Nucleic acid binder design. Structure first.
Length: 224
RNA sequence: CAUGGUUGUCGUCAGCUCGUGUCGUGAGAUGUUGGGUUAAGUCCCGCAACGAGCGCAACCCUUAAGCUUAGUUGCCAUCA
């Protein structure tokens, strides 16, 4: 559950953002400033972390899944790797506006993937007009790009893991509309009230994203 | 100038809309905007939009060249 402090300042977790870009609601979680950068208090960080850790093992033991998001490029592979580690579902590309609120139309497109995998094996990708061969292939690749990691999600996820709340604000709006708890990693200049389980950690360092989402992946691993 | 049916017209112009979702107290908006491109909301990239339908293509006829079948009532090369 707890992460050693040195594992954080080695991962750049203490790093925040410039004083220029600062949300004054982070003043509770900020510990002084270095080189004009608001250094997050690692103690507070760890504390908050080991509390979304117990909530997440609760979700995995109940049977719920966590929708990993983090379309940000620095979080892209970190989200993908640790979600499949836990058998959860991840988002790595453009968050489809209304994939949770408008699941009615998204459900057909999600099942379209498994449907598109079907015509290949039932033989109508073998008999096809020349342009339709690539046309239906193009429809596949678009869908794999977005609904690649959530193709097995059937209903609304019982939990959602946001890497950067400010970046993927479109996802948080859907979650709050359907009462979906969010575990989020806030660096600075982010709203700590738009999410419920707050991780005060750096959001740009490549290893910092990996280290915290792995512990959150460890949370599910100790629940299933 | 009660109408069915049929027709011109803008104009073969490329637009016209819908479902679910989202924003807006509301009329309304989005998608149908932006970066390019096309004869074409034609197509791509992105984007609170995700998908559709009537539209535009294509599909259908004729034409332009070729190959099989066919030899009359078509044709006339090898020959009289």
């Amino acid at each position: 559950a707890v992460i050693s402090m040195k594992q954080l300042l080695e991962a750049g977790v203490h790093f925040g953002h410039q004083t220029r870009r600062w949300n004054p609601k982070m003043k509770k979680y900020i510990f002084t400033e270095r080189n004009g950068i608001y250094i997050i208090d690692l103690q507070k960080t760890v504390k908050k972390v080991d509390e979304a850790y117990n909530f997440l093992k609760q979700v995995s033991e109940d049977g719920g899944q966590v929708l990993f998001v983090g379309t940000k490029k620095q979080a892209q592979e970190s989200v993908k790797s640790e979600a499949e580690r836990a058998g959860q579902f991840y988002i790595n590309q453009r968050w489809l506006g209304g994939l949770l609120t408008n699941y009615k139309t998204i459900s057909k497109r999600i099942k379209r993937i498994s449907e598109i995998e079907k015509m290949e094996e039932d033989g109508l990708f073998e008999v096809l007009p020349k342009k339709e061969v690539v046309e239906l292939k193009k429809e596949y690749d678009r869908l794999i790009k977005f609904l690649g990691g959530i193709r097995d999600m059937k209903s609304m996820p019982q939990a959602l893991f946001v890497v950067d709340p400010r970046k993927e604000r479109n996802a948080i709006a859907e979650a709050r509309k359907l009462n979906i708890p969010i575990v989020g990693i806030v660096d600075t200049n982010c709203d700590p009230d738009e999410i419920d389980y707050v991780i005060p950690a750096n959001d740009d360092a490549i290893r910092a994203v990996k280290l915290l989402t792995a512990k959150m992946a460890d949370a599910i691993l100790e629940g299933q």
